[model samples]
Target: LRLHLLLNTSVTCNDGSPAGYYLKESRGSRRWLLFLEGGWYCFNRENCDSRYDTMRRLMSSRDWPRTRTGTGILSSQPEENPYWWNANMVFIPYCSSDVWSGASSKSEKNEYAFMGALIIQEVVRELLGRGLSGAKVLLLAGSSAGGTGVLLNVDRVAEQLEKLGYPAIQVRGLADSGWFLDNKQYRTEAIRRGIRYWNGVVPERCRRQFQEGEEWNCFFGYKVYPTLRSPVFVVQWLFDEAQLTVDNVHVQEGLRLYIQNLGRELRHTLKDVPASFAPACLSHEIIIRSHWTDVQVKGTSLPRALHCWDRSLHLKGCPVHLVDSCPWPHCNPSCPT
Candidate 1:
């Protein structure tokens, strides 16, 4: 797949260059899987400034490659991406530091244009010209911040498509490592402040459900999951290393204990999700890994579970909501020690 530069749209990256994505077209495939590239964000001035200085690739599209390829869940290879390999694949790069939730553009106060949410809208609108209007299914999947974007934007995408006269397009989500616990100790401040810096716009319905000052709640997967109109599938680790480190939690003194509690809380949180695959492991993202098909929960690999979930919609297969019941961390034989 070659990188398709969306030059005519106002969907520019932080650096003001036009945003772009890789597209793999399949002749007669109606199923579409759009992968949102996930990466870090900048909550405030210093943090965001450093992002441009050190990780410009994440914030700018100035130097994007003319030809970019997909991998893991984005891969078109049958062996690597299994279920979604034949679907029309699109890889949206993470150029908006807003985790794809911002609705604002560059201003005098804010130097960078944080058009995360709008970027998605533009992409889909552009895709409408490229057969998205006729798509049978569209799965918006992401990892890390991008995964979180899935929760924040999946429903919005569905709503947008509906208004655009494509109500028949069945929108779905595949959030890998996007779920964040409401620990109230850390990260809570980031999205709260993010609403300010990025002009964050959460799911419209979830925003109304939350009070005026409580809009940040919509950023958490658990908080916004219930409000989603589209069906979604969550992929997470029992002990997500990224969440643990960011929360400043460690192993031992309360590390192992924290892991156990985190795992239990994860299980409890996912109870309502009709389709999920949560393996008891100490990792982060999975859908992008080549071995994603090998990581399983309760004997069902993510690939298989996803396959089943995809088929379940048509009543051909059963929906999978597998969660690890053991907190041993060692419970998943597939867990990498």
Candidate 2:
């Protein structure tokens, strides 16, 4: 399998299961991607097809045509085919969440998948260009949802990969400003901050009570997670409120618990966990420090800054950061040099 040195590329509509629509080789012994997206978005096949064509012709800072950088461009594809799936109002669990939930859901649905892909695109461009990824792979992610998803899903994804007879895929993830799925207060704060989806979904009484510190975000907990291990790099934007990432005390406390629960799951699954395996969520608004986003990030607004993950990674010059008290589990920080 010879690598294409010239980086000659083409945007083909290859909607393979899991990988979705991508910009990859017409055929290859091993199909890797510059960016592979997670779930939650309308896979804009037409836009992605156009994006890839644009990516190809883009010249580098050095003035030469940029190389394909990596083998796969799977992240550019849609989560589910736009034609068959409705982005207007997503209802199903693995389906789009835009239809009923409104803007917050729709935004999250899009950013979660796309942000990972974009960052990985940069990683792929740099790493693949330098000639790496011989069986080992780096599964990178950033910001609230992206950071959280890596921990929540890494084991499941790895298990599936191992089932395919490649247990040593070595998918190391980088999480930045991960939102805790276990923070009840945070959930309550989110509800109060006009997130509104939970308004009709959950009873008002329950929502109000949650603000008084309740157990929430049951889905993202590590307690129920299977034994899963991944080299996860994280950085926490440290600052009181970290309104950029966590909108208020509710968000901060909630996210702290969420990561804690996830850490428990990781610790249980992989005995004597790697130091880097723990979530190092910090409590500083790295977003503000970098001047990454002019729009104050908090609650739902978090996605706005997070969407430009490609820019954030380069701006922060770091892997991950959280905003809260304590380092491990609650809020962590790290930069994979």
Instruction: State in Å the error of residue 336, model 1.
Output: 3.6
Q: Where is model 1 poorest over a 10-residue stretch in terms of lDDT? A: 249-258
TM-score of each: 0.95, 0.33
**Model 2 regions lying over 4 Å from their true place:** 1-134, 179-227, 240-337
Model 1: per-residue lDDT, tens digit, 1-337?
Answer: 6788785667788877788878888868999888888887888888888888889999887778877767787788898988888888888999989889887777677688888888888888888888887899999999999999999999989889888888789999989898988773332777788788888888878888987889989888898999888999998887888888877765354566666777888889998888988888888788877777777776677888888997788733444988889886767899855
lDDT of 2 at 278: 25
lDDT of 1: 0.84
Q: Each candidate: what lDDT? A: 0.84, 0.30
lDDT of 2 by residue, 143-259 (tens): 343444445444444444566566555555444444333333333333232123221122223334444333233123233222235554433332223332333443377666664
Error of 2 at 237 (Å): 2.4
Candidate 1 residue runs with Cα over 4 Å from true position: 184-187, 251-253, 315-319
Clashes of 1: 5
Residue pairs whose backbone atoms clash in candidate 1: 106-113, 250-255, 251-255, 252-255, 252-256
